[PDB]
C-alpha cells in the first residue's frame, strides 16, 4: 500500500497518454501547449481527455475545475497536488 | 418521456430540471451576484479572523449563537395562544395519555375479573 | 453514627484555619479519610434495621446512599476548581465551607429518625445549593433558574408538613417502627386521597415527574459543576429514598388513586426520551435523561413489589454515578471550549485519545451496558412492571430503544468524525480529568462484580 | 474559460510553498527516534491449567449442588465398568 | 455456512486490497490467470454454493430442502426456497463472470501482489477445512432426528436440476 | 404427485386427509392382520436414552448402530451395514404408512362411491 | 528479491503459486471423484421408491361390491 | 452556486450534462467496447446540432435532454473510491491532525526530533514576518468594500508571500 | 528513477472487438473513436482468457490421472 510517484515520471505518463490520442499529432505535442488554440481540438474533446485521465488515475476532477486546465503543465501540477509527490 | 418528477416533502428537486433556470430574469442574475457578494464578504472576514497567528482560540461564530438563543431562549417570547396551538396541545398532551389510560383500565379489569373468579395460571406464579 | 457526624463538623473550620495552598490538601485528604469512615458503616444484618442513638437509625436502604454521598463529596471538591481558581481566597473558603455544610445537612437528611426531621433536612438540602448556583451560575438566567427551583420545591413540599403533623396528632409519634407496627388500612374517604396526594405530590415535585419537570433542566444548564452533580444525584435520589420510606402507609387507597401518576410517569418518560434526542446544548441532555430515569423510578415505586424496590434502588445508585460522570464530561469539553453548544465542538477522536474511551463507557452506562448496575436495575423494573401488567412492555421497550439512541447520539455528535479545524487552542488531557474519571467508573464496575450491597431492604 | 493570469502567478507561489513544505516534511536526522534508555506454551497453558484443575476439584465439589452430567448411554449388550453385570440384549431380529 | 463465507469474504478482501481498495464490480471484469490462487479460491467457494454433487456444501442445504419437501409443507415457502435457489445460482454465476471472466479492466501501475506467506497459509488452510470438514463433521454426529431417505422422482433430483438450469 | 392436484382441484372426498387419517374402524377388511412385533424391550428402551420421536419401531437397529459407533469410535468409517439396515427398516415403515394412506383411499373411494351410486 | 510492479503489461507468475492453485483445484476434483465414484451414488436415493404401493385389490383389503 | 461567478456560463451547463451522461453510461455499460460504441453514438448525437446559432432552441433541447437524462439515468453511478459518497470518502482520515498542534508536546520528545522542530520554527519566522503589513495592506487596499470574489491576488509587489498561505499549504498529505 | 514506460506505435490496434466496432461505426458513418487505449486491456498475456465453463473445466485437466492411479491403488 505504498505506490511511489515522481514528477518527471508522471509527466511522461500524462504526455504518453496524450500521445496515444488520435487527432493531435504525436510529433508536435508539447509539455507547455494550449488546448483550444494550437492542438486543434474543441471543448468537447478536451473534456474527453479529462474523462479518460480521470478514469486512468482513479479520482475525478470537477466541472467547476474543468473550466480552467487548458494546458498539460497545470494538469501535472493539479494531479501532483492531489498526490503530494515527494519522498 | 417521463411523468416529469413530482416534488414532495421527501422528493428533493435536483438542480438539473428546476425549470426556473430557463427563463432567467436579469434581476435574478443580479440576485445571484448579490448572493456571491454576501458569501464573498463573509468568507473574506472569516479568513481575516481565522488565519491570524497572533490569535489563539475559537472563531466566535455570531450566527450559531444566534441560532442557539433563537432555539432555546427565544421560544416563550413571542407567543400568543391561538386556535391551532391550543388544539394541537390538547391533541398531543391529552389524547394518547387518555388512550393508554382507558386501555390500561380495560386490561386491568380483565385481569381483576379473571383472578376474582380464580381461573388464572397461579399454579406457580411466584415472582410478582 | 455521631462518630461520623462530628468529624464533618470538625472539617468545617479546617478550611478556615488552613493557610494558602493548603485548603486543597487538608480538605481532600480528610474527606477521603471520611470516605474510609463511610465504607466502615456496613455492619447491618438481616431482619431489622440498626439503631444509632436515642435519636436515629440506619436502614439498609439509607446506607448505600450515605456511602454515595460521602463518596461523591471528595470527587466533587476535586472537580470544582480551576473555574473559580482565579478568584479570591476568602470566597474560595466560603464556597468550600458551603459545600461541607451542604454535605452535613445531606447526612442528616439520609439518616433521619422521623419525617418531620426529614422535612427540616429536606429544605435544608434545598437552600445552600441555590446560593451556590446563584453566586456561580456563570450564565445569564441563573436568576430565573434558582427562582423556579425554590418556588417549585417549596410549593410542592408545603402540604407535606401539615400531613405529617396530622399523622403525628392522630397516630402518636413518627418514628419509623412505631409509625410502623401500628398502621391500619384507611378506607376510601377523600381525606386519605388528599393526604396521600399531598405527600406523594411533594415527592413528585422532588423526582421530578413530567408535569413539573422544567424545574430540573434549567437548574442543570445554569449551574456550576458541584451544584449540578449534587443536585441531580443526591437531591433526586434523596427524593426517591424519601418516597421509598414514606410509602409504607395508605396502601388500601393507593390502588384506587395511583393510576394517573403512573400514566403521566410513563408517557412523560416517552416524551422526555423523545425530547433529548434532537436537542443541542449537551448539558440539557443529561437533565432530560435524568427526568426519563426518575420517571422509570417512579413507575417502579408506585408498583409495590420487592423486585421493583430492589431494581429501583439499583437504578438510583447507578444513574447517580452516571449523571455525575456525564456532567463532568460536559465540564471537560467546556474547559476545552467555552461554547456549551453541541454541534460546534466536534472531532476529538485524535485529540485527547483516551478520553474517548471514557465517553464510550459513559454512553455505555446510559446505554445499559449489559453487566452494569444500570441494566440490572432497569431489568428488574421491566420484570416487575410486566408482572403488574401484561401490556406495558411497548412503552418500556420504546424507552429502551430511544434511550439507547440518544445516548449513542450524545456519544457520536461531539466526539466522532472530523475536527472542525478552527478550534486550534486546546491542550492535551490533564491528569485531573481522567483522575475524576477513574474515581467515577471504577466503583461502578466493582459494584457490577458484587452487587450484594446495592439492592433494597428486601435483599 | 480558464485561469486569469493573476491566479496563475498566485498558483505558482503556493505550489512553490507546498513543494518546500513537503520537502521539509521529508525527515532525515539519520537517528530520528532517540531514547534515553515451546516455553511460551509451557507457561501460558500450564499455569492456568494448574489453577483451574486446583479450583475444579476442591471448592467446586465442596459446593455440593454443582457441576453435573447427563450420563453416557448404557446399552443392552454391554458390561458395566463400575459394578459389573450383563444386561439382556435384544431378541430375534428377522425378516430384514 | 461459517467456513463457507469466512473463506469467501477473506478471498474477496484479498482481491480488494490487491486492487487499490476500489471495491467495485464495474472495472473488475477478467482477472483469471492473474494469480490463480485467489481465483481458484473464489471459484471453489462459488461452486460450493448450492452444493455441487456432492461436496461440503451439498449435505446441509440439500438435506434441508429435501426434509422440508417431505413434510407438512406450507405450499408456498418451498416454492420460495426453490426460486431463491435458482436465484442464488444465477448471482453466484454473475459474481464469477463479472469478477474473473470478462475482459481485464483496471488502472495501470498495478500493486497486484499475492506473493505473501500469511495469506496463502490462511487460504490454503481454509480450503483444507472447506473440502474435508463438511463430510467429516456431517458424518460423526449423533442422529438426533429421523432422516427421510425415501423420496420420489424429481424430489431428490430437484435441487441439482434447478441449480443446473 | 397427482394426489395433491386431485385433492385441491377435483374432490377432496375420495382422497383421505392428514391429521384425520383413521376414518374407517379396524377389522373391516383385515381379517386376522396384526403382528406388531416390538420385542425392543420398553424398559431397556428407557434405559438407553434415545432421542424422543425415536422410541419407535426399528429402534434395535439404532441400538446396535450406536453400540458399534461407541465401542469402536475412532474407526471413523466402521458402521454402515447396520446403518443401511436401519434405513431399510424405516423404508419398510414408510412404505407401510403409504400403504395405510392408499388402503384408506381405495376403501373410501370404492365403498363410498358404490353405496352413493346405488343408495 | 520479491516482485516489483510493472506498467500496463501482463503480470508475471511464479511457478509455485500456479502449481499450488492447480493442485488445489485438481485435488478438489480428486476428492469429488473418489467421493463420487467409489462409494456413492448419493444422487439416487439408495432405495426403489415404490408405485401406488401395490395396485392390489383386496390385498390390504377392500370389500367385494 | 459557484466560487467565481454567479451565473455558470450555459456552455458549461451543457458540458456538465455531457460529463454526467458519460459517467452514467460508464455505470450503465460494462465490456468497455460496446461502451465505446454507445459513447461515440451519444457524441455524434450531440454533434448533430452543435452549430445552432439560436439560444431558445438550444435551451429547449437542453430541457428535453434533461428529461431524457433523468428518465434514462442510473441509480448507482460508478463513482470513484476518492469521490464524495464513494468507497473511501476520506477512508484514512484517522491520522489527520492539523499541524497547529505538535507544539504542545513534551520537550523530551521535542529533543527527540530537533531538525523538524527547528525548521518548523523557521517556517514560523516566515509566517510571522510577512503577516502584518503586506498581507493586511493587500487585503485592505486592492479590494473594494464589497470584495465581490473569492480569489486572492498574488503578492506581486516585490518579495514575500501572497496572503492566506498557512492553512492552504500546511494541510496533510491526504494519505497517511 | 526509471520505469521505462513501454511506448506508443507498438499496438497498431488490429484487435477483434475494436476492429469489429470500428467497422460497424464506419458503416454507420462516424469514423471517430477514442484511439488505441484499450489495446493493453485487450491483448498481450490477455486475448483468449477462458470462458465460464472452462473455469470449471480447469478442475479435471490434471486430476484424472491421479484419480485413476488412486483407483488402481
Amino acid at each position: 500500500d505504498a505506490p511511489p510517484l515522481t514528477l518527471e515520471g508522471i509527466k511522461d505518463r500524462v504526455l504518453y497518454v496524450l500521445k496515444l490520442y488520435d487527432k493531435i499529432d504525436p510529433e508536435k505535442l508539447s509539455v507547455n501547449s494550449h488546448f483550444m488554440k494550437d492542438l486543434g481540438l474543441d471543448s468537447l474533446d478536451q473534456v474527453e481527455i479529462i474523462m479518460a485521465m480521470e478514469d486512468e488515475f482513479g479520482f475525478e476532477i470537477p466541472d467547476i475545475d474543468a473550466e480552467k486546465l487548458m494546458c498539460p503543465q497545470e494538469i501535472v501540477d493539479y494531479i501532483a497536488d492531489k498526490k503530494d509527490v515527494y519522498e | 418521456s417521463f411523468p416529469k418528477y413530482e416534488p414532495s416533502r421527501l422528493a428533493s428537486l435536483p438542480t438539473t430540471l428546476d425549470p426556473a433556470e430557463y427563463d432567467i430574469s436579469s434581476e435574478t442574475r443580479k440576485a445571484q451576484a448579490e448572493r456571491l457578494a454576501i458569501r464573498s464578504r463573509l468568507k473574506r472576514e472569516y479568513q481575516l479572523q481565522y488565519n491570524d497567528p497572533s490569535r489563539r482560540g475559537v472563531v466566535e461564530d455570531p450566527a450559531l449563537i444566534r441560532w442557539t438563543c433563537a432555539r432555546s431562549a427565544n421560544v416563550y417570547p413571542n407567543f400568543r395562544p391561538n386556535t391551532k396551538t391550543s388544539l394541537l396541545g390538547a391533541l398531543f398532551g391529552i389524547g394518547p395519555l387518555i388512550f393508554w389510560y382507558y386501555v390500561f383500565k380495560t386490561d386491568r379489569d380483565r385481569k381483576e375479573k379473571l383472578i376474582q373468579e380464580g381461573k388464572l395460571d397461579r399454579t406457580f406464579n411466584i415472582s410478582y | 453514627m455521631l462518630k461520623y457526624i462530628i468529624p464533618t463538623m470538625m472539617l468545617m473550620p479546617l478550611t478556615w484555619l488552613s493557610k494558602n495552598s493548603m485548603i486543597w490538601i487538608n480538605t481532600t485528604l480528610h474527606s477521603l479519610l471520611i470516605s474510609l469512615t463511610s465504607l466502615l458503616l456496613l455492619n447491618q444484618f438481616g431482619d431489622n434495621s440498626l439503631n444509632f442513638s436515642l435519636t436515629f437509625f440506619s436502614d439498609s436502604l439509607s446506607t448505600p446512599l450515605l456511602i454515595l454521598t460521602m463518596w461523591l463529596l471528595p470527587l466533587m471538591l476535586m472537580a470544582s476548581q480551576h473555574h473559580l481558581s482565579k478568584e479570591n481566597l476568602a470566597r474560595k473558603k466560603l464556597f468550600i465551607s458551603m459545600l461541607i455544610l451542604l454535605q452535613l445537612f445531606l447526612i442528616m437528611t439520609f439518616t433521619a429518625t422521623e419525617l418531620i426531621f426529614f422535612y427540616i433536612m429536606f429544605e435544608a438540602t434545598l437552600v445552600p445549593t441555590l446560593i451556590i448556583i446563584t453566586r456561580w451560575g456563570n450564565q445569564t438566567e441563573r436568576l430565573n433558574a434558582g427562582l423556579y427551583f425554590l418556588f417549585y420545591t417549596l410549593a410542592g413540599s408545603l402540604p407535606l408538613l401539615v400531613a405529617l403533623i396530622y399523622i403525628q396528632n392522630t397516630m402518636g409519634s413518627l418514628n419509623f417502627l412505631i409509625l410502623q407496627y401500628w398502621v391500619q388500612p384507611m378506607p376510601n374517604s377523600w381525606s386519605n386521597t388528599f393526604m396521600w396526594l399531598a405527600c406523594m405530590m411533594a415527592f413528585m415535585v422532588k423526582m421530578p415527574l413530567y408535569g413539573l419537570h422544567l424545574w430540573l433542566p434549567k437548574a442543570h444548564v445554569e449551574a456550576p459543576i458541584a451544584g449540578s452533580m449534587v443536585l441531580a444525584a443526591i437531591l433526586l435520589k434523596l427524593g426517591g429514598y424519601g418516597m421509598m420510606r414514606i410509602t409504607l402507609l395508605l396502601n388500601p387507597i393507593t390502588d384506587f388513586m395511583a393510576y394517573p401518576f403512573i400514566m403521566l410517569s410513563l408517557w412523560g418518560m416517552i416524551m422526555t426520551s423523545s425530547i433529548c434526542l434532537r436537542q443541542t446544548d449537551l448539558k440539557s441532555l443529561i437533565a432530560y435523561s435524568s427526568v426519563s430515569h426518575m420517571a422509570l423510578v417512579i413507575v417502579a415505586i408506585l408498583i409495590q413489589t420487592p423486585w421493583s424496590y430492589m431494581g429501583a434502588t439499583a437504578l438510583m445508585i447507578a444513574h447517580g454515578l452516571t449523571s455525575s460522570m456525564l456532567f463532568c464530561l460536559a465540564n471537560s469539553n467546556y474547559e476545552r471550549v467555552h461554547s456549551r453548544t453541541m454541534i460546534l465542538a466536534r472531532g476529538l477522536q485524535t485529540l485527547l485519545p483516551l478520553m474517548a474511551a471514557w465517553w464510550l463507557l459513559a454512553s455505555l452506562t446510559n446505554l445499559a451496558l449489559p453487566p452494569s448496575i444500570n441494566l440490572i436495575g432497569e431489568l428488574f423494573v421491566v420484570m416487575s412492571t410486566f408482572s403488574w401488567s401484561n401490556i406495558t412492555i411497548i412503552l418500556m421497550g420504546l424507552n429502551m430503544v430511544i434511550t439507547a439512541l440518544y445516548s449513542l447520539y450524545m456519544l457520536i455528535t461531539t466526539q466522532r468524525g472530523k475536527h472542525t479545524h478552527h478550534i486550534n487552542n486546546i491542550l492535551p488531557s490533564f491528569t485531573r480529568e481522567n483522575a475524576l474519571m477513574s474515581l467515577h467508573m471504577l466503583p461502578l464496575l466493582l459494584l457490577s462484580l458484587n452487587p450484594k450491597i446495592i439492592l433494597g431492604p428486601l435483599y | 474559460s480558464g485561469y486569469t493570469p493573476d491566479e496563475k502567478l498566485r498558483l505558482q507561489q503556493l505550489r512553490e510553498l507546498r513543494r518546500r513544505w513537503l520537502k521539509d516534511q521529508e525527515l532525515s536526522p539519520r537517528e530520528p527516534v532517540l531514547p534515553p534508555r515451546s516455553i511460551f506454551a509451557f507457561t501460558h497453558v500450564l499455569i492456568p491449567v494448574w489453577i483451574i484443575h486446583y479450583y475444579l476439584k476442591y471448592h467446586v465439589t465442596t459446593k455440593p449442588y454443582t457441576i453435573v452430567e447427563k450420563k453416557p448411554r448404557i446399552f443392552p449388550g454391554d458390561t458395566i465398568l463400575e459394578t459389573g453385570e450383563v444386561i439382556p440384549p435384544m431378541k430375534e431380529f428377522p425378516d430384514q | 455456512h461459517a467456513f463457507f463465507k469466512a473463506m469467501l469474504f477473506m478471498c474477496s478482501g484479498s482481491i480488494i486490497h490487491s486492487l487499490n481498495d476500489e471495491q467495485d464490480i464495474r472495472k473488475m471484469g477478467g482477472l483469471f490467470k492473474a494469480m490463480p490462487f485467489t481465483t481458484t479460491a473464489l471459484i471453489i467457494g462459488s461452486l460450493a454454493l448450492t452444493g455441487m454433487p456432492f461436496l461440503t456444501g451439498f449435505y446441509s442445504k440439500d438435506l434441508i430442502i429435501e426434509s422440508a419437501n417431505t413434510s407438512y409443507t406450507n405450499a408456498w415457502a418451498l416454492l420460495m426456497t426453490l426460486v431463491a435457489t435458482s436465484f442464488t445460482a444465477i448471482y453466484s454465476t454473475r459474481i464469477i463472470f463479472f469478477a474473473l471472466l470478462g475482459q481485464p479492466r483496471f488502472p495501470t501501475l498495478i500493486n497486484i501482489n499475492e506473493n505473501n506467506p500469511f495469506l496463502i497459509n490462511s487460504i490454503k488452510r481454509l480450503l483444507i477445512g472447506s473440502l474435508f470438514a463438511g463430510f467429516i463433521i456431517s458424518n460423526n454426529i449423533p442422529p438426533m432426528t429421523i432422516p427421510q431417505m425415501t423420496m420420489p422422482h424429481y424430489l431428490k433430483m430437484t435441487a441439482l436440476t434447478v441449480t443446473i438450469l | 404427485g397427482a394426489h395433491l392436484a386431485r385433492r385441491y382441484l377435483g374432490d377432496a372426498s375420495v382422497e383421505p386427509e392428514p391429521l384425520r387419517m383413521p376414518t374407517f374402524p379396524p377389522d373391516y377388511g383385515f381379517p386376522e392382520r396384526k403382528e406388531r412385533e416390538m420385542v425392543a424391550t420398553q424398559q431397556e428402551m428407557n434405559d438407553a436414552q434415545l432421542v424422543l420421536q425415536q422410541r419407535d419401531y426399528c429402534a434395535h437397529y439404532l441400538i446396535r448402530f450406536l453400540k458399534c459407533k461407541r465401542d469402536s469410535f475412532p474407526n471413523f468409517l466402521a458402521c454402515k451395514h447396520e446403518q443401511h439396515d436401519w434405513d431399510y427398516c424405516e423404508h419398510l415403515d414408510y412404505v407401510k404408512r403409504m400403504k395405510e394412506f392408499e388402503r384408506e383411499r381405495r376403501l373410501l373411494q370404492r365403498k363410498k362411491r358404490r353405496e352413493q351410486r346405488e343408495a | 528479491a520479491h516482485i516489483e510492479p510493472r506498467y500496463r503489461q501482463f503480470p508475471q507468475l511464479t511457478r509455485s503459486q500456479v502449481i499450488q492453485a492447480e493442485f488445489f483445484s485438481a485435488t478438489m476434483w480428486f476428492w469429488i471423484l473418489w467421493r463420487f465414484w467409489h462409494d456413492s451414488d448419493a444422487v439416487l436415493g439408495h432405495f426403489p421408491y415404490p408405485d401406488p404401493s401395490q395396485w392390489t385389490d383386496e390385498e390390504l383389503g377392500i370389500p367385494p361390491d | 452556486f459557484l466560487p467565481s461567478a454567479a451565473y455558470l456560463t450555459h456552455q458549461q451547463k451543457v458540458l456538465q450534462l455531457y460529463k454526467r451522461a458519460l459517467r452514467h453510461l460508464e455505470s450503465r455499460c460494462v465490456h468497455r467496447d460496446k461502451y465505446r460504441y454507445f459513447a461515440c453514438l451519444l457524441r455524434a448525437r450531440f454533434d448533430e446540432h452543435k452549430n445552432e446559432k439560436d439560444m431558445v432552441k438550444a435551451t429547449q433541447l437542453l430541457r428535453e435532454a434533461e428529461k431524457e437524462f433523468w428518465h434514462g439515468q442510473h441509480p448507482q453511478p460508478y463513482i470513484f473510491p476518492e469521490s464524495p459518497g464513494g468507497t473511501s470518502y476520506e477512508r484514512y482520515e484517522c491520522y489527520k491532525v492539523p499541524e497547529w498542534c505538535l507544539d504542545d508536546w513534551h520537550p523530551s520528545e521535542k529533543a527527540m526530533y530537533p531538525d523538524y522542530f527547528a525548521k518548523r520554527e523557521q517556517w514560523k519566522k516566515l509566517r510571522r514576518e510577512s503577516w502584518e503589513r503586506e498581507v493586511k495592506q493587500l487585503q485592505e487596499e486592492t479590494p473594494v468594500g464589497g470584495p465581490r470574489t473569492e480569489a486572492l491576488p498574488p503578492a506581486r509587489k516585490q518579495g514575500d508571500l501572497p496572503p492566506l498561505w498557512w492553512h492552504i499549504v500546511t494541510r496533510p498529505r491526504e494519505r497517511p | 528513477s526509471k520505469m521505462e514506460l513501454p511506448d506508443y506505435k507498438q499496438w497498431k490496434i488490429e484487435g477483434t472487438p475494436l476492429e469489429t466496432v470500428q467497422e460497424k461505426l464506419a458503416a454507420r458513418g462516424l469514423r471517430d473513436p477514442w484511439g488505441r487505449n484499450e489495446a493493453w486491456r485487450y491483448m498481450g498475456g490477455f486475448a483468449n482468457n477462458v470462458s465460464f465453463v472452462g473455469a470449471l473445466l480447469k478442475g479435471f485437466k490434471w486430476g484424472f490421472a491421479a484419480f485413476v492411479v488412486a483407483v488402481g491403488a
Side-chain angles (χ1 to χ4, degrees), chain B residues 25-67:
Chain B
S25 176
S26 179
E27 294 180 355
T28 58
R29 295 295 188 193
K30 186 179 286 185
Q32 293 174 356
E34 288 173 349
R35 187 175 297 113
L36 190 274
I38 293 301
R39 286 181 288 111
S40 179
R41 189 181 70 249
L42 287 170
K43 286 178 94 287
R44 181 62 57 84
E45 289 186 354
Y46 186 83
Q47 295 298 104
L48 287 175
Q49 291 182 358
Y50 175 70
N51 293 319
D52 296 331
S54 62
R55 195 263 300 161
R56 180 64 178 170
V58 298
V59 76
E60 293 182 355
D61 192 3
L64 194 275
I65 300 299
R66 184 180 296 117
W67 178 71

Side-chain angles (χ1 to χ4, degrees), chain B residues 1-2 4-5 14 16-17 21-22 29 32-33 36 39-41 43-44 47 50-53 56, chain H residues 2-8 13 20 59 63 66-67 70-71 127 131 139 143 147-150 164 167:
Chain B
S1 297
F2 194 76
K4 294 186 263 75
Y5 187 73
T16 61
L17 65 161
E21 205 178 4
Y22 291 158
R29 295 295 188 193
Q32 293 174 356
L36 190 274
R39 286 181 288 111
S40 179
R41 189 181 70 249
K43 286 178 94 287
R44 181 62 57 84
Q47 295 298 104
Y50 175 70
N51 293 319
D52 296 331
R56 180 64 178 170
Chain H
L2 71 156
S4 65
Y7 62 95
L8 56 95
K13 186 188 260 82
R20 289 178 61 186
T59 186
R63 178 174 64 240
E66 291 177 355
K67 296 291 179 67
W70 187 257
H71 185 198
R127 182 183 178 180
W131 178 252
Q139 289 296 321
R148 294 181 66 249
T149 187
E150 297 184 358
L164 282 69
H167 285 278

Side-chain angles (χ1 to χ4, degrees), chain A residues 45-64:
Chain A
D45 294 329
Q46 192 273 128
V47 179
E48 290 180 353
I49 295 293
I50 297 304
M51 173 62 75
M53 277 58 254
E54 287 176 355
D55 290 328
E56 187 176 1
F57 284 162
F59 58 96
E60 291 179 356
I61 67 99
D63 287 329
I64 195 64

